[PDB]
UniProtKB/Swiss-Prot annotation:
Pathology noted in the entry: Chromosomal aberrations involving JAK2 are found in both chronic and acute forms of eosinophilic, lymphoblastic and myeloid leukemia. Translocation t(8;9)(p22;p24) with PCM1 links the protein kinase domain of JAK2 to the major portion of PCM1. Translocation t(9;12)(p24;p13) with ETV6.
Tissue-specific expression: Ubiquitously expressed throughout most tissues.
Result of altering K3L: In myeloproliferative disorder with erythrocytosis; requires 2 nucleotide substitutions
Protein name: Tyrosine-protein kinase JAK2
Organism field: Homo sapiens
Gene this chain is encoded by: JAK2
Whole-protein residues included: 537 to 808 of 1132
Length: 272
């Protein structure tokens, strides 16, 4: 990662929190192309000082994905390691995370919008699968909306997948349980079961989010009941808009080896 000076970063408003991180909108002063000076909006992801032990996991995962440039993968500008904070300096996506976008725009979003976003997310995941890179935290919060749909120009929405974050292979067990049903059953049984098949399960959960107006599946269940949900081998309820429910359930297969390839997922999406 390119090293960015603290003096060249301005921290502005808080945009919430991630997993052991605090999120800020900011500005980066930089020399750009042709030597032109720019002040660039950036997303600043700040690893909590009280969790400095997780620093390696978060930045290594952001790094590994940043080694694969792709139109549906978020761009990382570099890191700021000045002072006592570890900061990922990321592109600022205008419309933020999809989980909040789905809630705020539930009435406006139709099946065509959902299918397009699903197709784009599957394209990103197919790219990762072909490169044998595990994301490990596919969820609507980690889908960033670059561009809204514009029916006036027929422009579809455009999304990117955010950085993996701290690996579930090092996260505390209680955070993993709260991340049911995005974390697949085999990773609850053993977080070292993390595998490409992990992302197929979480992709199913993410489609469920996309189809559920920003609702969080199983949010009414506490961590103990989420554990028992997997023990009893339940599936998620079909979303009211059920057009993707079969695909959701096919992806959320309790047998990891039976989960379909992203190529097959894409073929299925193209058939709707
Ligand atoms: N690159 C980027 N650009 C924006 N732009 C943005 C954000 C919010 C708004 S808001 N509030 O006014 O609606 C508007 C714009 N967000 N962003 C992200 O990476 N967010 C993000 C933050 C934390 C995450 O954590 C996941 C986890 O670690 O569990 C995941 C994702």
């Amino acid at each position: 990662f390119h090293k960015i000076r603290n003096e060249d970063l301005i921290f502005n408003e808080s945009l919430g929190q991630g997993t052991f991180t605090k999120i800020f909108k900011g500005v980066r002063r930089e020399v750009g192309d042709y030597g032109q000076l720019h002040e660039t909006e950036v997303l600043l992801k700040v690893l909590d000082k009280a969790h400095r032990n997780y620093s390696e996991s978060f930045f290594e995962a952001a790094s590994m994905m940043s080694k694969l440039s792709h139109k549906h993968l978020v761009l990382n500008y570099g890191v700021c390691v000045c002072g006592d904070e570890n900061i990922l300096v990321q592109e600022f996506v205008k419309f933020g995370s999809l989980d909040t976008y789905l809630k705020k725009n539930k009435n406006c979003i139709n099946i065509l919008w959902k299918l397009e976003v699903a197709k784009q997310l599957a394209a990103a995941m197919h790219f990762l699968e072909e490169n044998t890179l595990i994301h490990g935290n596919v969820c609507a919060k980690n889908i960033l909306l670059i561009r809204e749909e514009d029916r006036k120009t027929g422009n579809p929405p455009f999304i990117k997948l955010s950085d993996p974050g701290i690996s579930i292979t090092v996260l505390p067990k209680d955070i993993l349980q709260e991340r049911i049903p995005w974390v697949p059953p085999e990773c609850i049984e053993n977080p070292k079961n993390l595998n490409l098949a992990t992302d197929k399960w979480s992709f199913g959960t993410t489609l469920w989010e996309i189809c559920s107006g920003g609702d969080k599946p199983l949010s009414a269940l506490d961590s103990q009941r989420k554990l028992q949900f997997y023990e009893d081998r339940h599936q998620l309820p079909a979303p009211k808009a059920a057009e993707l429910a079969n695909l959701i359930n096919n992806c959320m297969d309790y047998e990891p080896d039976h989960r379909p390839s992203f190529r097959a997922i894409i073929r299925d999406l193209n058939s709707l």
